[PDB]
Amino acid sequence: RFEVKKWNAVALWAWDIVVDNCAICRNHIMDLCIECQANQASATSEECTVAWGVCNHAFHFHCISRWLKTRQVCPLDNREWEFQKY
Amino acid sequence: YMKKAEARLLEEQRRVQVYLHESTQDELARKCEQVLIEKHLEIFHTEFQNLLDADKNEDLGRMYNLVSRIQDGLGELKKLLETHIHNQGLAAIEKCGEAALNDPKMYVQTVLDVHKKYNALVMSAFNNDAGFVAALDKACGRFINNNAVTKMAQSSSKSPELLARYCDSLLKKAELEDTLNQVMVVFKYIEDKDVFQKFYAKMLAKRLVHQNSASDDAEASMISKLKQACGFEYTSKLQRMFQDIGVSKDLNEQFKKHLTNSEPLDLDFSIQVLSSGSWPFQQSCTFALPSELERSYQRFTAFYASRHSGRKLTWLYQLSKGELVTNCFKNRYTLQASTFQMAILLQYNTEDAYTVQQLTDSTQIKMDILAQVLQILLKSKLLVLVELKPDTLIKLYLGYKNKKLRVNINVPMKTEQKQEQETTHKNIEEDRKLLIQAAIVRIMKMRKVLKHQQLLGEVLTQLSSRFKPRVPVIKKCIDILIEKEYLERVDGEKDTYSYLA
Amino acid sequence: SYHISNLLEKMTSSDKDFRFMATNDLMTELQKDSIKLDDDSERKVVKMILKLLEDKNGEVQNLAVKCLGPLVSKVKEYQVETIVDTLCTNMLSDKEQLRDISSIGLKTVIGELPPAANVCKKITGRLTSAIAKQEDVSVQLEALDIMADMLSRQGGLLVNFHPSILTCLLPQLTSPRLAVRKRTIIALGHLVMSCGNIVFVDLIEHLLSELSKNDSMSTTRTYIQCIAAISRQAGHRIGEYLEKIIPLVVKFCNVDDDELREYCIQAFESFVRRCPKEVYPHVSTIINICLKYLTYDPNYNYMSWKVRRAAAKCLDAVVSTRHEMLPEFYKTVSPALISRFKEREENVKADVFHAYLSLLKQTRTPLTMLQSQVPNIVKALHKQMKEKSVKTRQCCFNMLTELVNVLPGALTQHIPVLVPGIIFSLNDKSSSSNLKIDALSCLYVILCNHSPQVFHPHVQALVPPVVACVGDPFYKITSEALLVTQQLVKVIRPLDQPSSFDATPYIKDLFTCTIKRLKAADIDQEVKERAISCMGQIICNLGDNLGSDLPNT
Ligand SMILES: [Zn+2]
Ligand SMILES: [Zn+2]
Ligand SMILES: [Zn+2]
């Protein structure tokens, strides 16, 4: 018989606007890109990861990389985009 | 003979000033210096090596004073001193053996003692000459980034990792300022600063989450030193975590004042809510919450959903700890354990014998993690039954005793350290590739058409303050950028690239 | 005019890459030979840099901070004033990022100023008011750091503001935050480096008056630390006040507080080291206090170790600088240290060992007193040589080596009790490479400075461990083993003296262990040279008893 006295837990918070999936492409964030999954395996498919921003928004690295070639704004909030994690 | 030569030179100066003409002074001094010094430089160099071998600072200072009169006579001394310092550093590192591969204190103290000794020698005897300082700097930079320890690890990135681990050991739970300053002096000679930055950030996050720091003043001083040495983005990244800690403290206070106007909870509850993009932690494995803890879970989830609308919380159960108090034993013991341990002890709350397969089904923990935590429990004499199988029988051991009422069982598992080190090294390599790609893209955006060698030179110039890139990696990044439709090879004029919109 | 206009057009391109590259190109142009004689471009460039200091991207902000350096060297003196004003007024802002980036930029600007008077005057005027404001702590700390940086270099330019600097600094030695006190102490030392005589006496008199009244325990420690720092930093200027300073510290030494005693002994050490001439009358009382508090341990009988460390370090400092004190040194200091070789704390033991090593180094009549004290040293070392700590045994071996180097024949009657310890350290799995090398060096020094007769009974015990050490995988051990083996060959059969010792049974072992190193072709150069020398000595001394191996050798 053991009794619990005190508990110290750690939690992380993320935006719930998107249901655990990319916003630019309608795919699960742990899966591959549309272009990556459509194309044959290559060096580009090796470097497919998840990129976070200062606004705590999560997209595929390739998705936001393609989005940034024309616009300099996060898709979900109108502020400028800055990479902070991979 | 050195003292004899100095005395003779003084006597000659006295003679020429007292009973000769003024026009003879320069020529007589030149001839005397020639005859007395320049003809014995071969002997002087061997004596210099011998005096360096057996520490004799006064003789070295006298010889520096003597040879400084001869034009271009100090170069050989500088080269010999640089070689001697390099050899001494290599020998000092080599004598520590294999133990220095997993002992940051020994490695850093050896380097620091060598540097202190030869800095003192340069300042005291050579009058802080620029060339001798440069020789000491080159020798230190040569033997810090390549030595016996780095050969064992087959990578020059072991030194920054050891330095960061030494800093973490220093800052964990008056003379600390001096050793921090000395460490920052060592940091200047390191070429792979990104490895140090990554390791320091990870260990600072671990320190902040678990609340084990010697003092906040030491952390502030180290942050100030990093401001002075590193850039401005890194310190901002650290300040983000420092701000999240305060936000979590305020939220804890608000939750505590909220619990008064409701039914109080049985246990003492504290939480650290952190942003998912500013901390190095990953998602936890599958885990079924113990039956005594859903109350706090639901209450805090409701409170957070009330105060913040569009956010969702993910719970890291591998970084959570707590207290278990036991009463069905010889005497009243209170023990500190992780959430996994608390879950896998309270499974047999009234039972006495389980099969690890049943324990796996009840706790929903994977194979390796459960095996490691069970081994840790068994080694603690708290539980009794080396290899384990799914049909192994493990039973609670009654009547165990310890010399102290307060016992902790949250000892780290051996494999996690090595796995974490490998993971962060791989992450560092991937980040290096990404920054090289970004630099190439930006340079091509600025200059529409540029050659190969100029591109490489500008890339190394831009990335020099963090690490020294390898040219094959730059070619690989260029090739992967060509495929991704970022830049294209122009027809004709081979080995030339142009930016493509 | 066109390149600069294009650069400033790009520096607001709404794309981070363009701004970064434009700022980098501007920085490269600034460090080059390009000059902008036009006074219309300078204002625009300065404003653009000061606005990019607040950019939304970290890289651009960092590059702008770095660009603030070369800008001041190639811009008229009017714009430097507005740059400094903008930075100083930004340090007082509510935004934390702006304050931090402005502090970094202001330190960078100060760094580039040649060792100028007007800008330093403005900076000092702003920072005095910044330090004076005690409402917030972060601004205080940043201002204190910048003031220390600005006083370390260019300190001699701002002579007129020294009264104001002292007046603003002095009240901060009482603030509830210890970081403020430490920064104030650093700034005060830097100020003492470049100051007039009036302010120095003002500071010393204020410190003495504040120490004369014991308002709080916390502040007294700060004042003692400040006095120690001032003494350590200035030196000669504080010597005239020791006659009044020392009795206060002596009175404070007797207070029952562990932290206070350590600071007092450190102040004593600083006085002993930095100013030698004015401490002559007080060496006796300093030594007596150090001896009294060297054995301070209330909760044990055969944080109280910090005072012991401080006392031993102060004794080391006293011994290492006074050469005329040697008779009374050997009269009183040496027995206490010898009796304290048995300290139960490793660090204090190491520091007392270092102190007695410094005494031995200074010893180079004192020799007769050292010879009389030798038996106690040997009796103390015999117990320490069997400890399980590598550092203690290393200290013992080093001190024996130094003692033999000072007195050539000091260990004639104690070889029977000293050889077993060396042997035990030689063949022990817990020993490290450094311990074995130190033991071999001690053995070599002992053998080189004594008559061969005293080692004859112990050759049978000394040969096997040395032969084993010759075959060690580590070459650094092998070199020292061969060096010891050469002297062992000299001892076993002397050539200039008659000996009745039989050297026959030990010839084969030495020859076999040396020949293998001699014919290696892949070992390090040092081992090759040592093997050649050792084999030459073997042939010279005992080459008559070798068989058919001589032609091949
Ligand atoms: Zn996507
Ligand atoms: Zn992809
Ligand atoms: Zn966003």
Is C56 close to A72, i.e. CB distance below 8 A? Answer: no
Instruction: Report the half-sphere exposure of A73 (CA within 13 A, side-chain side).
Output: 6
Looking up tokens 């972060």 gives C138
Whether A28 has a binding-site annotation, put simply, is no
For B406, phi then psi, to 5°, come to: -85, 115
For chain C, what is the radius of gyration of the CA atoms?
34
Distance CA C71, CA C46 (A): 8
Structure-block tokens of residue B141: 């930079």
Q: Which two tokens stand for residue C307?
A: 């005072």
Is B499 within 8 Å of A69 (Cβ atoms)?
Answer: no
Report the alpha-carbon distance of residue B123 to residue C403 in Å, rounded.
30
Residue among B209, B268, B327 whose CB faces A10 most closely:
B209
Q: Which residues of B fall below an 8 Å CB-CB distance to C?
A: 91, 94-97, 99, 217, 220, 224, 227-228, 231-233, 235-236, 239, 441-443, 445-446, 462
Under 8 Å CB-to-CB from B491, ≥6 apart: which residues? none
Residues in chain A with CB shorter than 8 Å from the CB of B476 are 43
Contact partners, residue C400, CB within 8 Å, separation at least 6:
C381, C411, C418, C442, C446
Experimental method: cryo-EM
Three-state DSSP class for B500? Answer: coil
Tokens representing C215 are 């308002």
Strand partners, B337: B322
Cα distances from B472 to residues B262, B436, B477, C431, in angstroms, run 65, 12, 9, 46
Our measurement of the distance from residue B415's CA atom to the centroid of its chain's CA atoms, rounded to an integer in Å, reads 20
Q: Note whether C414 and C378 are within 8 A (CB).
A: yes
Give me the amino acid identity at C400: L
The residue range of the domain holding A71 is 1-84
Any idea which residue has 């003379």 for tokens? B175
Distance A59 CA to ligand 3 centre (A): 10
Q: Please report how many Cα atoms fall inside a 13 Å half-sphere around the Cα of residue B485, on the Cβ side.
A: 5
* DSSP track, C359-408: HHHHH--HHHHHHHHHHHHHHHHHHHTT-S-HHHHHHHHHHHHHHHHHST
For residue A55, report the distance from its CA to the centre of ligand 3, in Å.
Answer: 5
Number of domains in chain A: 1
C479: left (phi over 0), alpha (psi -120 to 50) or beta: alpha
Give the DSSP H or E segment for B150.
helix B148-153
Q: Are the beta carbons of C52 and C23 closer than 8 angstroms? A: yes
CA C402 to chain centre: 22
Q: Provide DSSP, B14-36.
A: HHHHHHS-GGGHHHHHHHHHHHH
**A42 contacts chain C (CB < 8 A):** no
Q: Compute how many other C-beta atoms are within 10 angstroms of the C-beta atom of residue B21.
A: 7
Contacts for B396 with CB less than 8 Å, ≥ 6 apart: B348, B352, B353, B383, B384
Whole-number Å distance between alpha carbons of B112 and B106: 10
Q: Which two tokens stand for residue B136?
A: 């000491």
Contact A76, A23 (CB under 8 A): yes
Structure tokens at B33: 């210096």
Distances (CA, A) of B247 to B243, B275, B311: 6, 11, 15
| A64 CA to centre of ligand 1 in angstroms | 8
CB atoms within 10 A of CB B337: 24
What SS3 class is residue A16? coil
E strand map for C204-267: none
Chain B contact for A15 (CB, 8 A cutoff): yes
Q: Residue C50 in contact with residue C86, Cβ under 8 Å?
A: yes
**Beta-sheet pairing, B487-489 with B449-451:** unpaired
* Identity at C152, one-letter amino acid code: S
**What is the distance, to the nearest Å, from the Cα of residue A48 to the centroid of all Cα atoms in its chain?**
11
C367 vs C370: CA distance, rounded Å = 5
Residue C307 region, left (φ>0) first, then alpha (ψ -120 to 50), else beta?
alpha
Which of C494, C441, C448 has the alpha carbon at shortest distance from C469? C441
Q: Does A30 touch chain B (CB under 8 A)?
A: no
- Partner C contacted by A80 (CB < 8 A): yes
Q: How far apart are CA C214 and CA C473, in angstroms?
A: 64
Spatial neighbors of B344 by CB under 8 A, at least 6 apart, are B359, B363, B365, B370, B373, B374, B377
Phi, psi of C113 (to 5 degrees): -65, 130
The CA-atom distances, in angstroms, between C361 and each of B114, C340, C355 are 22, 19, 10
Compute the distance between CA of residue C157 and CA of residue A29 in angstroms, rounded to an integer: 62
Helix, strand or coil for residue B155? coil
Residue C273: which of C310, C321, C226 has the closest Cα?
A: C321
Domain containing residue A47: CATH number = 3.30.40.10
Q: Rounded to the nearest whole angstrom, what is the distance from the C-alpha of residue B465 to the centroid of ligand 3? A: 30
